[PDB]
Amino acid sequence: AIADVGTDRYAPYFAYAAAQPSDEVTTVRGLSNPLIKTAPVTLPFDLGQAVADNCLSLSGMGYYLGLGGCCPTCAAAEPRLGRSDRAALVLAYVQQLNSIYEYRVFLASVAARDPSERALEEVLAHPELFFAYYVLRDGRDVRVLFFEDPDAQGALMMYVVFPEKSVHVHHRVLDRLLGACAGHRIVAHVWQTMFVLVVRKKGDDVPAVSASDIYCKMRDISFDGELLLEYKRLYAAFEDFRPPR
Amino acid sequence: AIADVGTDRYAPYFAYAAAQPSDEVTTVRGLSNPLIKTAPVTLPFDLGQAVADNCLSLSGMGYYLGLGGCCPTCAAAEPRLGRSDRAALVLAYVQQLNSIYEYRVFLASVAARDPSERALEEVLAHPELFFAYYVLRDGRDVRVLFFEDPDAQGALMMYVVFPEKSVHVHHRVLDRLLGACAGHRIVAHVWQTMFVLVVRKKGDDVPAVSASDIYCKMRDISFDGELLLEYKRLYAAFEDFRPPR
Amino acid sequence: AIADVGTDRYAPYFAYAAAQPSDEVTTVRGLSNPLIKTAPVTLPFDLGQAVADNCLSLSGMGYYLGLGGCCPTCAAAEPRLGRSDRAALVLAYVQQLNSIYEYRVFLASVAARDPSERALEEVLAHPELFFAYYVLRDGRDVRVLFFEDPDAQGALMMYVVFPEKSVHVHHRVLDRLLGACAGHRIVAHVWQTMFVLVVRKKGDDVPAVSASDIYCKMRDISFDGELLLEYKRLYAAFEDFRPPR
Amino acid sequence: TLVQRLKLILSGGNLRCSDACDPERPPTRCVFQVHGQDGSNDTFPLEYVLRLMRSWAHVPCDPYVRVQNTGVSVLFQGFFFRPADAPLAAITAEHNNVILASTHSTGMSLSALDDIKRAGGVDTRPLRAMMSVSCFVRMPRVQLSFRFMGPDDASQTQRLLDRAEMRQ
Amino acid sequence: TLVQRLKLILSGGNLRCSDACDPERPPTRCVFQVHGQDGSNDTFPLEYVLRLMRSWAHVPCDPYVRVQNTGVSVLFQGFFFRPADAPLAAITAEHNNVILASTHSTGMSLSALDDIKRAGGVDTRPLRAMMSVSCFVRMPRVQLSFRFMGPDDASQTQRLLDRAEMRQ
Amino acid sequence: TLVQRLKLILSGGNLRCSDACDPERPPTRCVFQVHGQDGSNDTFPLEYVLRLMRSWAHVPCDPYVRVQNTGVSVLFQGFFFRPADAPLAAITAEHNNVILASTHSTGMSLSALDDIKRAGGVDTRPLRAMMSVSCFVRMPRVQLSFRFMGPDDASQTQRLLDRAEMRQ
Ligand SMILES: [Cl-]
Ligand SMILES: [Cl-]
Ligand SMILES: [Cl-]
Ligand SMILES: [Zn+2]
Ligand SMILES: [Zn+2]
Ligand SMILES: [Zn+2]
């Protein structure tokens, strides 16, 4: 009697649910409204902890991991990202790895830091970093910074610096971001008021990338002068950053 | 009277079908269940004899040309191959002809047999052979063998050796296979217990293939040692094969 | 009506079997007596066609593949072979591969044909041939002959010549024989009135066999003179044998 | 009048039909022209329309349909008599595939169809087993298959034949 | 409902079974899956369960069972109709052994079984001679034998058929 | 009998279920196996089926479900008692995400669920707040989220509990 209760208040319903199956279906389907629609997080935050319908929101109000289906900022973009065809999206950035001319923002970062072909070889060696940039461009005005990974084998890590003081990564966008960068860890940070996603290796069908051919195209291209200086200032600001392992 | 019958048993129905049109529609649409759902075949078997909804099944139980809509093995894969967009599928293997890095199984066959650039020139000269491999990979662990065609002008033929003792080509897969390889004859054979599809020329929008650039990429790539030895054993087993014209 | 019958005589029983489950159990278990207890075969006969309870019988009366559970010759030996522990039996001939001193009949064949160490190296290279001899010795007075396999890569085949004009391989014995010689084909033949099992390769945990140490032991051993001469006569009789592939 | 029926018969599928016949004196010329555009997978009820033509005529005949690849669509040409030289598919009941290259053609008459039906042990009872053409238009070729099709529910077909037998 | 019967039928042996069928409209998909682990020597009463499936259906059918080697156990897949391409053992009544390598499969339908039964001069009288599969699982292979099995006492079987005939 | 109910409960979603239990003596072995193929986004009503298992048993128990990544689909294994060593998710009511790599597994029992429910200040009144598993199959991983779900209209749920209370 003392161990039994406790609480035995479900027993009347389950007797009734056996007799009434058409009620049992509507009761189960009825339980659709989630009680917690957004929850706070702290930086540094591993994006791998977010599931397919989670969106990230970073601001002065705080950092939040919300449900996409109840999020107004996700709803506004939901018609724009409505296709969501991953067979085409995986083939898209695989195809766009071949031609990197339009993507000034990506190459400019290399041009500003170290404009040699050996630096361009080291960047093109990790094609998942371009995929990260391609995904985050679509769903706009991000900046990329390549640094050396001091707590790993001789390979580089990318910082994705956001322009605005308020940031919102759509659920479909970070679903694509995490899928495209399998074998890279993505963590969200803040540094000198700038939100930033560090993309480094943690532990694939890609075309063979000609480092010399793009290096030839680099000389023909005329970059925006104010964008290259921006990178030099941004590289200077992120030198003492030291993101934890 | 003697020539007349014979048999005149349809006449009552057709008189009735004239009076009742709504019955005539349901009677015609009603005749939907096909009496023969699969039929046996013998090897060598020309795959050109199979229509768009036919699937091929090869095993110890025998060789069969079945209807896809009544086939359980076809039904299981029908959600996976559900898009079936040929505009994108024709453009897919055309685009993937440019970048051959991921496709180790295809290149390894060339590497094992004859790793020169002249051998790679002769392979890349017939891009429909790669298309055949690309289609049969999607719908998995096949092996390809390039031999010389002794009953034709100086050009090579491909054998597609299946791994398992039971084989099943989906109806959509061999529809794509035959469509992609227009100008090549595909015939199914068996040799030393291994089922094999011989793809040779019988009697197009493709990119210009740089034989030297892929040959450069070949040296950088590190093949699986056990896969190259496998090919050497497989080439040794298929030397005295002699597939008929 | 014409297609229906045919014959519909089971319908009364199955209606009754639904009502009476305790009868259905006894009816199914009741069907235990097999109608065909032995069936004739012809030589050459591949022993791989025999299942675990099949026994082979070779005589002037003919060649037969019988069921062990209804065979009097199998029943007599069933208490002697009653343990049937394959964990110990696989470990037995693996252990007995180390010490080949008692097994005069096996080594004498090598001694008589070619008493060098290189011949002993070629024999000990195929340890499944000893396993075949070990199994067929237990369940008695067989003779072994090593010849070269002319329709395969440079490796030898063994003939197991039976002494008597009547032969009977127990079901457990040929179950063990086939299991122990996985990767060798066993076929039963007749040659100059002598029944013989040809054990050759068709297409494993074994100790490393020291050919020099056994070759040293061979010189110390004193063979039976009449057994070595027997082998010389037997090798002479089996020279023009030519067993088919 | 027959084209009204032929359009009704094909109304379930997506096969275009083109718009007189004397029952006592049936014409040797082409009676109907069914067209099927590239990409389609529609089914033509061959045995039905062939046996429909036999009932339409009061004089003895042997109805025939010609299947042709125009090099853009498929063409089914209807006839009351098989013209001189017109092709017949050598197919059996089990092996029934015919591929057509551009401009090539095959066909089937009621009499040759009856030979195939009897040779394959197929059920001759009305509407129980009916030959139909599954056509797939994969340019430049036209893929045809002369398959026998039965009803999903035979008990329904047997009751329909009683309804016709009642009104007689 | 059939799985209840199938488990009862196999309760004497040690063959695991996996847990709806409409009598008017029988499904083309797999109906049951019997499994048999490595080392076992159990017997599957093939002809019984095949003829059980025929009585279960009120529409004409040809029941079929597929025997497969998974590469760990044996698999018996039940069907009301033999699927397209599905294998049939070429065995006779006297020569009835089939060895299966890993992933390979064979099978048997009621119609092909009747051909074998009549061709071998086997007794067609109910429950006097019934095909059953003796299977031995000797990894990596699966050894099968399609043997006809009769009753130990025929006089008992004849009296059981009278008990069924009485209740009708 | 429970699988009939479990299939009915999951009939709204697209989660495959696999086909006896004694109310007095409940088994320690696995009771049901729900499967969810790659690409799907279906929701498993965990708290409902857990509390359904408690009512099913007349002897005291602590029902448990195990969620596993097979490396192709998701697997939900039902139990009346949590087996020895079987995993429990450390999640709270607000922080409830669990990612599973290939072959890895987590689970949840009714007792550990009650601790989480009381610790988060969640409404314990019947059917007002119910834990459910949102699962996304993004190969090679399986993404799980143990979210509490309430009804869209609470006034409807309160009237349903009166209908059950009336019949008693
Ligand atoms: Cl980081
Ligand atoms: Cl060929
Ligand atoms: Cl031999
Ligand atoms: Zn959002
Ligand atoms: Zn198929
Ligand atoms: Zn015996």
Residue numbers in the entry:
A (entry chain 26), B (entry chain 1A), C (entry chain 1K): 19 to 157, 160 to 223, 229 to 270
D (entry chain 1B), E (entry chain 1L), F (entry chain 27): 4 to 22, 26 to 174
Text taken from the publication that reported this structure:
Although nucleo-cytoplasmic transport is typically mediated through nuclear pore complexes, herpesvirus capsids exit the nucleus via a unique vesicular pathway. Together, the conserved herpesvirus proteins pUL31 and pUL34 form the heterodimeric nuclear egress complex (NEC), which, in turn, mediates the formation of tight-fitting membrane vesicles around capsids at the inner nuclear membrane. In the nucleus of infected cells, pUL34 recruits pUL31 to the inner nuclear membrane to form the nuclear egress complex (NEC). Thus, the NEC represents self-sufficient machinery that can mediate inwardly directed vesicle formation.
To study the assembly of the heterodimeric complex into a hexagonal lattice, the former was fitted into the cryo-EM map derived from cells forming native NEC-coated vesicles. A lattice model was generated by global rotational search of the heterodimer and applying 6-fold symmetry; no further constraints were applied (for more details, see Experimental Procedures). The modeling resulted in the location of pUL34 most proximal to the membrane, thus validating the overall orientation of the fit. The long axis of the heterodimer is tilted by ∼70° relative to the membrane plane, i.e., being 20° off from a perpendicular orientation to the membrane. Our hexamer model indicates that pUL34 loop 88–93, as well as the pUL31 ZNF and loop 77–79, forms the intra-hexamer interface stabilized by hydrophobic interactions. To form a defined curved lattice that is key for successful budding as observed in situ (Hagen et al., 2015), the inter-hexamer interactions also have to be specific. These are established between hexamers at both trimer and dimer interfaces. Our model suggests that the hexamers’ trimeric interface is formed by pUL31 helix α5 and that the dimeric interface is formed by pUL34 loop 22–26, each interacting with their counterparts on the neighboring hexamer. Finally, the fit in lattice arrangement provides an indication where herpesvirus capsids as NEC cargo are likely to bind. The membrane-distal face of pUL31 is thereby suggested to form the inner coat of the cargo vesicles. Overall, the fit, based solely on a combined clash and protrusion score while not taking any mutation information as constraints, is consistent with previously reported data and results from our analyses presented here.
